[PDB]
Amino acid sequence: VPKWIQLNNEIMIQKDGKFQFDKDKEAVHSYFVDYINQNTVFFHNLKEKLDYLVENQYYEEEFLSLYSFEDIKEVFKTAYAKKFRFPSFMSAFKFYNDYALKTNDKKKILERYEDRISIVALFFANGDTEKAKEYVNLMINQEYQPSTPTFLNAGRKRRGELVSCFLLEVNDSLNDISRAIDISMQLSKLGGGVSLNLSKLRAKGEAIKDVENATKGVVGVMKLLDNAFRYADQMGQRQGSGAAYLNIFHRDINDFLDTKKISADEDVRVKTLSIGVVIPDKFVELAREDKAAYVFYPHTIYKEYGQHMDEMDMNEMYDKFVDNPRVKKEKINPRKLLEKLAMLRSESGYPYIMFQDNVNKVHANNHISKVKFSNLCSEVLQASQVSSYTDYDEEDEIGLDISCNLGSLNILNVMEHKSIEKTVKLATDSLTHVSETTDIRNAPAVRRANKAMKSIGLGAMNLHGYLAQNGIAYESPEARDFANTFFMMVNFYSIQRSAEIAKEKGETFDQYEGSTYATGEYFDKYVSTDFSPKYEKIANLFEGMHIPTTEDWKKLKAFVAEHGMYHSYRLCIAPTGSISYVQSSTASVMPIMERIEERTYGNSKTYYPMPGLASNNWFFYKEAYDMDMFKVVDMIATIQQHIDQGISFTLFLKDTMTTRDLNRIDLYAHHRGIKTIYYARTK
Amino acid sequence: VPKWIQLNNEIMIQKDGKFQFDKDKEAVHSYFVDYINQNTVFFHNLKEKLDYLVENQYYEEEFLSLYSFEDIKEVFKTAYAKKFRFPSFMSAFKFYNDYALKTNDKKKILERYEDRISIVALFFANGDTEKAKEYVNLMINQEYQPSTPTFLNAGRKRRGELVSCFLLEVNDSLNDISRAIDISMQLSKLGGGVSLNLSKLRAKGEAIKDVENATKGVVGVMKLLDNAFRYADQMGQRQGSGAAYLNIFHRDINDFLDTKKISADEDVRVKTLSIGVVIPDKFVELAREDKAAYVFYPHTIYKEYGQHMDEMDMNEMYDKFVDNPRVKKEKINPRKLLEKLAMLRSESGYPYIMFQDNVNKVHANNHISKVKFSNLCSEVLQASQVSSYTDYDEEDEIGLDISCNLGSLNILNVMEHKSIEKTVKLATDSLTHVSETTDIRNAPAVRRANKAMKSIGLGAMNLHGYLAQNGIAYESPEARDFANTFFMMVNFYSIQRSAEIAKEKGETFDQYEGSTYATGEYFDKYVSTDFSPKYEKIANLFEGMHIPTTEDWKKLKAFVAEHGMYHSYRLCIAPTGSISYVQSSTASVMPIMERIEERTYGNSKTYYPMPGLASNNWFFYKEAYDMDMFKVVDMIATIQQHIDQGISFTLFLKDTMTTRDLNRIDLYAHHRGIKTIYYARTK
Amino acid sequence: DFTQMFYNQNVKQFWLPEEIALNGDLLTWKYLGKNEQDTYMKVLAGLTLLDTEQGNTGMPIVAEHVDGHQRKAVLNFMAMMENAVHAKSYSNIFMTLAPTETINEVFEWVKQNKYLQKKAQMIVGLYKAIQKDDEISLFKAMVASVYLESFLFYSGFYYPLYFYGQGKLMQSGEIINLILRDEAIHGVYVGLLAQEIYNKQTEEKKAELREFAIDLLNQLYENELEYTEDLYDQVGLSHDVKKFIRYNANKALMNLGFDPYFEEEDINPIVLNGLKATVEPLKDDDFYF
Amino acid sequence: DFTQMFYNQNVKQFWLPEEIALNGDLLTWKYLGKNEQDTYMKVLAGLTLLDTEQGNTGMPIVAEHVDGHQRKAVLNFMAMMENAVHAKSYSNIFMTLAPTETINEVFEWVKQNKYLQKKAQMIVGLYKAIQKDDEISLFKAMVASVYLESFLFYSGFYYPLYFYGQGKLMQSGEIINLILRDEAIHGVYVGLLAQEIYNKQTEEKKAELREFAIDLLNQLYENELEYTEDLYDQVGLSHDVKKFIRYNANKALMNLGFDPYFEEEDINPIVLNGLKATVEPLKDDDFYF
Numbered sequence A, B: 001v002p003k004w005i006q007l008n009n010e011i012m013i014q015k016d017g018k019f020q021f022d023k024d025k026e027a028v029h030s031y032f033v034d035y036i037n038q039n040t041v042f043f044h045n046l047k048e049k050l051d052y053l054v055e056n057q058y059y060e061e062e063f064l065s066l067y068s069f070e071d072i073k074e075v076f077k078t079a080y081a082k083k084f085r086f087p088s089f090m091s092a093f094k095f096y097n098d099y100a101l102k103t104n105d106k107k108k109i110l111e112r113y114e115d116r117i118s119i120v121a122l123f124f125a126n127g128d129t130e131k132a133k134e135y136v137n138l139m140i141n142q143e144y145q146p147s148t149p150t151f152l153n154a155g156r157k158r159r160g161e162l163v164s165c166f167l168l169e170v171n172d173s174l175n176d177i178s179r180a181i182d183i184s185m186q187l188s189k190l191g192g193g194v195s196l197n198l199s200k201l202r203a204k205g206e207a208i209k210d211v212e213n214a215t216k217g218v219v220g221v222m223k224l225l226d227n228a229f230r231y232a233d234q235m236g237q238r239q240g241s242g243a244a245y246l247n248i249f250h251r252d253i254n255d256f257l258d259t260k261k262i263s264a265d266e267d268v269r270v271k272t273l274s275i276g277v278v279i280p281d282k283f284v285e286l287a288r289e290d291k292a293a294y295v296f297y298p299h300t301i302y303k304e305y306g307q308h309m310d311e312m313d314m315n316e317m318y319d320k321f322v323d324n325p326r327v328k329k330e331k332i333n334p335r336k337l338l339e340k341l342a343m344l345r346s347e348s349g350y351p352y353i354m355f356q357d358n359v360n361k362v363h364a365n366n367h368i369s370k371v372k373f374s375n376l377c378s379e380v381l382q383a384s385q386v387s388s389y390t391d392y393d394e395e396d397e398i399g400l401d402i403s404c405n406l407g408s409l410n411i412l413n414v415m416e417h418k419s420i421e422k423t424v425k426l427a428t429d430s431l432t433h434v435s436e437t438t439d440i441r442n443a444p445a446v447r448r449a450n451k452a453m454k455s456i457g458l459g460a461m462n463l464h465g466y467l468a469q470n471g472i473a474y475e476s477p478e479a480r481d482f483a484n485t486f487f488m489m490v491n492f493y494s495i496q497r498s499a500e501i502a503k504e505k506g507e508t509f510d511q512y513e514g515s516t517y518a519t520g521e522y523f524d525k526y527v528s529t530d531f532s533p534k535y536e537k538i539a540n541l542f543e544g545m546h547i548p549t550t551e552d553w554k555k556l557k558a559f560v561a562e563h564g565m566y567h568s569y570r571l572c573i574a575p576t577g578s579i580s581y582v583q584s585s586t587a588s589v590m591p592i593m594e595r596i597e598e599r600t601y602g603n604s605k606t607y608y609p610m611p612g613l614a615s616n617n618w619f620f621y622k623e624a625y626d627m628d629m630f631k632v633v634d635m636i637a638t639i640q641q642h643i644d645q646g647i648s649f650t651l652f653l654k655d656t657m658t659t660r661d662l663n664r665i666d667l668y669a670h671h672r673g674i675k676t677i678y679y680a681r682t683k
Numbered sequence C, D: 001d002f003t004q005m006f007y008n009q010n011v012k013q014f015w016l017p018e019e020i021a022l023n024g025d026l027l028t029w030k031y032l033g034k035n036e037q038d039t040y041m042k043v044l045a046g047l048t049l050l051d052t053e054q055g056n057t058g059m060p061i062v063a064e065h066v067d068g069h070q071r072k073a074v075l076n077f078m079a080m081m082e083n084a085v086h087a088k089s090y091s092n093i094f095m096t097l098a099p100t101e102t103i104n105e106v107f108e109w110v111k112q113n114k115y116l117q118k119k120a121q122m123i124v125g126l127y128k129a130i131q132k133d134d135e136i137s138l139f140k141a142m143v144a145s146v147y148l149e150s151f152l153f154y155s156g157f158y159y160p161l162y163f164y165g166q167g168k169l170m171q172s173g174e175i176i177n178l179i180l181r182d183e184a185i186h187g188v189y190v191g192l193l194a195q196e197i198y199n200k201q202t203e204e205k206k207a208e209l210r211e212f213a214i215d216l217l218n219q220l221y222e223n224e225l226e227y228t229e230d231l232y233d234q235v236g237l238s239h240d241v242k243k244f245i246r247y248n249a250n251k252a253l254m255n256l257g258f259d260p261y262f263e264e265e266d267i268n269p270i271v272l273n274g275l276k277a278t279v280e281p282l283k284d285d286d287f288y289f
């Protein structure tokens, strides 16, 4: 047995009635001095290291050529001057197993944490030495963490894309379905997760050029996409991950949901394709009144009205669709559909739930389009325009397919350094650079929307870690007060940085003038309502850091109206799965699942206590399954009001609660303004 | 039970020790008089019928506008002047159930046999009244039958394509694989069978741009294509049919064959994808000497030589591949692979066997490319060039994908009319017209090859019917003598008509100058060997008909050298499945499977004696299973020497036949020059 | 060619009675007339009684005489579903809708009923007549089993499906639909085992087995018509139930590889809404001619 | 007093081998010596044979003779587990770890192994000797079944447990632990049925039944010793396994209500270390907060 995992297993050996949490420090120390320093390739000087990495196709020469070697040396000194030490064995293990650069035979270790951070910072700065040092300080202090694609691939030659979330709109044609399959395989080949909207596709039993009952529905396209994602699996190390989204008023909604039933046949069930359901407020209203709802055939609506069903407002056109004889509709029970959704989430965790009117009542770019679906992680909520891929000889009408670069603030380290403003602005700059350097040459709509919208996603993590290490319960009103103030400040500084970038570059995102930022309606609750902490305990947490007031928000509103905004979307809170270990942080803004997390890697068993877990804060680290999901919904809705995109909201369910409890949680989330619900995790 | 169904069922009722074959005339008469004349929409004049058909979106106004109504009336007069009568109930039933035009609700009948033939002839002539009358005489005499797509769809507004066989090359790239899936779905949507060459795709466990062992091989593409064909199911009318071809020296050949095993896993098995194996002479030579053979990874060969493995001559390149250390291979047993092929054909009828060197030793367009694979029916053998489908922004390099137009001479009717020359030339003209009028907007390589090659397929049928009705056994040497003479004449007149078309249009097919037609090497066996019948009985069959001599072939060679050749390919003997009933003919050049065909339509069972079956010729209608497959191979090889493309050669096996017997049949077919083997049908 | 595939489909259809909450059926049950409640009870008891024979005798006796480890395993799984899942499910439905005394009386009535007894004893008689190492007697029992699984249950299934298609008794209707889905696959599987025996027979023996199957079908069908009128005339449904019996008789015949006996009919839309030759090596000289 | 709780326990323990991914054992398997792999394959093959006969014959035949629909439902469920779940799981393990030829060879080896044939002959002979309405022949078969469940499997179980306890072959080991968890409850249940029959007898008859049980145990034990030596001598573990089978023999006797027969011994501590949601309808008040 390895010495470091033997030391790491001494955490669970209870001495004097307490877990030996200090063993993890010894565990990581032994891990380093017995595996990492031995397996680390060391060069005489940094110049030899960089030459070796560039020559052997490990790094990219173009980005390293913008700095003189003295500047690169200064950046590396800045990284190593911090003398960063991993606080736990899991942090270092995850870094050196997932993100640290290794030789071509996966034998030795080329990059330390400081080397990777310095390379990512030099990639972000794009020739600026001082900006590179600022990025080094930001990441070595672990105030900001670039997403897994960016952190893993920044500055590497044989790399995937820095963006891993893509959203595709599929038009109701065979050419568009073929192009969707092709683009899905191309993006899965790059390593990204692809989400597809299947609402514009006509339902099963619709006509294909005046021959009736000819269309196979969205389930045939679902099978096509599932096999396309199985094919493009990148060695199978990380198999192709796709998501399909369907509006709840699509006729194929029941067959769409039946693809996830355990008793589904092999000719229907999809395995590699996650599913999400988009629910307008009309469906919730119909289920609330116990009235008879109707699902519609999309092609009939398109023929009758000239627009797709999901491109229309269901809360204003549902009655017109029902009364229209030329529209084909099928009678359903909305409460039965809700119960089926709850049962499917209990048994499989699917579908993802998107509350469409919750997304679009606060959506800033409804002039471009309404948000019709989310991503594979169920937190990207941006306007999309469907493309019209025509025959080979004809020109294609390229729409807007969503993609944003992810990045997380570490709430604990940002709050410790009293650096919300600087961290948010530097992270915004880094995400803007990642957006600018991304060029997808096989997804035309993704490329066009990346150039036009310039959307970024700046998330946060370690919310529960910060609260538990500060003696605040996750369900407590003080926690929601802190989240309100913190994320209002993050929104303020992200909007300020976007406006400053627009002023400097002299350009805004496409169709900015129609957005709510340009009209000033976005800032109504910010110029009217003060978001300063209401509790003295929370107010001391922000001591030494200026909290923008209503006057500051009015000044920012004037600044945005006079200079514009560079990013259509700025903030989205992703799950942040594996980078949470490296940053020694709790995953996303969701509460922790286990206080001490037990994992098996190969034939070795190791335990990961939550960051900062001890006996003085053991009960503040309440597990997500033991807490009220209504209070978690309250917390996420408090955070969501300052986030322009969505939040990956996992529901943590006990075995005792029925499908009625899951439905009640979903309805309370819809009532409280929750935009999306990610997973129904059951213990 | 219908009266005609009862009358047709009285054939099996044996009266005086003989079948009541005359009951089928009563059966068809009752069928007509009781159902067809009742359900046939009648109009006061032909003008009213034509106006109703064009205005109600049944016909195309474009081709009918090319004639004055007087010319169309005279064409219809010519069709009805023959007073054509269906000899059997099954002929009329098949026509009026598969090809006759019906109302949009499929309740009444708009088209009789004469109306369908007149419309097809008017579409063929393209404005020529005398040519239309000639086509009417050719088809109402049932000397020439256009293929099911052409016969069914010609002159129809809501029609599929007139071509149903397509052959696609798939390049070793994700862009090309996605484009192949798209084109396969587009062509299956049109109702055409699609054949895909998978030999260029790199095998399983190959490197993808420095990531070794990352390719799923040809089986992942096979699953993608199977799901693509399942989705593109011809508007839910007829199941989507596709074929995949792999070289026997491809590394994935065993995985390719395992997709057809009855015990195949659901993640390996393909359902709607037929498989064909391409076998060079090198494999047969290795199996003959029992030397252990090697299957090669195609990407290693492409990297080492810059050419695809299937683009190179395995006879000269096999030793170089084996001795090359940079070419990856694994040992196989060629005899074990042959036994596996025979076992698979016994169990499921798959794969098709294409003898690569048998095709290419007589191929007239080896300069353009070698023939690497066949179609879904194993008779189309043409040169193909793989397309390089690049990224979306870049320009694609369009190659040549095979698609030929099918037509069948009725050997019995052509022989009784003494009109081999006239029928062959008119059929060539009609196939040329179908080729010119075909434009496919989503298969650029198919369209380019149709425009450039101008290849057609003129088949033959009713060989066994003609022989049995003339007192000649199918396995007899006299039958092979007749086949030799008849198909030599067909080849002579097809070459003459092609050269005449080239002279008239002043253009040949693309890259004709490199063909064996241009150099005269094609005509060597025709200017050196006499193909007149060697039997007095066979020579009497051709009485009143000039059999081309050696001097005639020399004159044709001079004419082709002077004026060129319009069609790269002219003759291919397709199975001719359903059009054989309408023509009262035995299917293709194959012998009959059963003397009397027992089939069930709806809830009523039907009986179909072979055309011309009686007491006097009962034993000349020997069933195919009772025949010696060696003699059938001899017959097909006699025909194959005059057919530039292949022949759909079905093996008819008894249950007592072993794997060794099937292997012996395959090896004798290879020895005798058979190009392709279609099916292993076991009784 | 088929046992592993059926194994997969069977085990992936596994379910338990507890999964469906039954109490909410009382909200529609209370609104049915006496004749509707009476017919439902009688139909339910009919299904229960027949399914018990299949669990205690039909499936285990076939599993005993069929050769092959994998077939015995699939057959064991099917027997388990009858005894452990279906039987408990029928009991649960009864206990929810009727008090103990009413259940006992309905079972007393249906136990004495002439048409239910006739078919139950005809089927059981064929199971009892199977002889060791006699594939003819096994085939006859398999035919009886297919007729029960794919045909005889359906005069009963009609009513729960009829309610289920109208939005009435939805919880018990869901249970019945799961049961019916199991019986469908049971019928198809046993049908394939019967065809295997049938295909091993001479032409004269085949004709004799066909006559047996058709004769048996006729006897059962004529009794089903009487059974149907006895239960469904009081609720006015017999005409439509008869169409459903014939449609399912045709499915049972097709399971046994036989032609349909009855003309095709449309079914009540409410019920619809509810619903290797020989491997030989190449020994050289086969490559030379 | 017990069948219902056994019914509930059995159905709540339901599992399929496909729930456990086995590719994780590939490396620890590759790393074992040829002797170790040979013993492991053979051990699981011996287990497969026992479960094949317990599923095909033992459990169904006992089910046939035991009275009461609930008792029959438990026994039918246990039978299904034997051949549809347990016996099949071993093939999942074999198909992952071993090439087809090694799999073919080990199944040929079970057919010709004299100890495995002897134990099957003895156990199945007793199953097939059961006479209808003869409780003594039934008791004898139930003793045989308890000895199969609680004693005979254990010469086989030792080795997967021995590896599991060292952190080796842990996915295969997880399957085996699930199988063992099932057999433990199967042995207790059949033991309770056997005790029911035993308790009906005179003191004289009881004395004879104890003689039968002890004579049978000793005969099986002596054969198992030779089997154990044959398999384990090449891996050096025969003495350790022998201690384990004696331990489990005592558990089998206890399941039958008899005193332990072998003296207690220290077992290898490694081996000791080797050891839908409810649907509720939505209310109107659920939509307001």
Ligand SMILES: Cc1cn([C@H]2C[C@H](O)[C@@H](COP(=O)(O)OP(=O)(O)OP(=O)(O)O)O2)c(=O)[nH]c1=O
Binding pocket: A171, A172, A173, A174, A175, A177, A201, A202, A207, A208, A209, A210, A214, A215, A216, A217, A220, B189, B231, B232, B233, B234, B235
């Ligand atoms: C061709 C084809 C289409 N479809 C479905 C998927 C598409 O969403 C939908 C549109 O197909 P299209 O490619 O748009 O077919 P079309 O343009 O000829 O028909 P229309 O005039 O009605 O637009 O039909 C199938 O389900 N199966 C098929 O084989």
Ligand SMILES: Nc1nc2c(ncn2[C@H]2C[C@H](O)[C@@H](COP(=O)(O)OP(=O)(O)O)O2)c(=O)[nH]1
Binding pocket: A041, A042, A043, A044, A045, A046, A047, A049, A073, A076, A077, A078, A080, A081, A115
């Ligand atoms: N020598 C050396 N330095 C490395 C390596 N990887 C990262 N570094 C960092 C450590 C220092 O902060 C910085 C400069 O190291 P150096 O080139 O040895 O310079 P110096 O120590 O002579 O000033 O580079 C490495 O492999 N070797």
Ligand SMILES: Nc1nc2c(ncn2[C@H]2C[C@H](O)[C@@H](COP(=O)(O)OP(=O)(O)O)O2)c(=O)[nH]1
Binding pocket: B041, B042, B043, B044, B045, B046, B047, B049, B073, B076, B077, B078, B080, B115
């Ligand atoms: N009248 C009529 N003729 C039809 C129809 N379908 C095909 N025909 C053919 C029959 C004749 O050969 C030809 C001309 O028919 P017509 O218009 O009645 O001609 P005429 O005999 O009055 O000059 O058209 C049809 O529906 N009606």
Ligand SMILES: [Mg+2]
Binding pocket: A172, A173, A174
């Ligand atoms: Mg369209």
Ligand SMILES: [Mg+2]
Binding pocket: B172, B173, B174
């Ligand atoms: Mg490439």
Ligand SMILES: [Mn+2]
Binding pocket: C051, C054, C081, C082, C086, C179, C183
């Ligand atoms: Mn049942």
Ligand SMILES: [Mn+2]
Binding pocket: C054, C082, C149, C182, C183, C186
């Ligand atoms: Mn059943």
Ligand SMILES: [Mn+2]
Binding pocket: D051, D054, D081, D082, D086, D087, D179, D182, D183
């Ligand atoms: Mn067992």
Ligand SMILES: [Mn+2]
Binding pocket: D054, D078, D082, D149, D182, D183, D186, D187
């Ligand atoms: Mn057991």
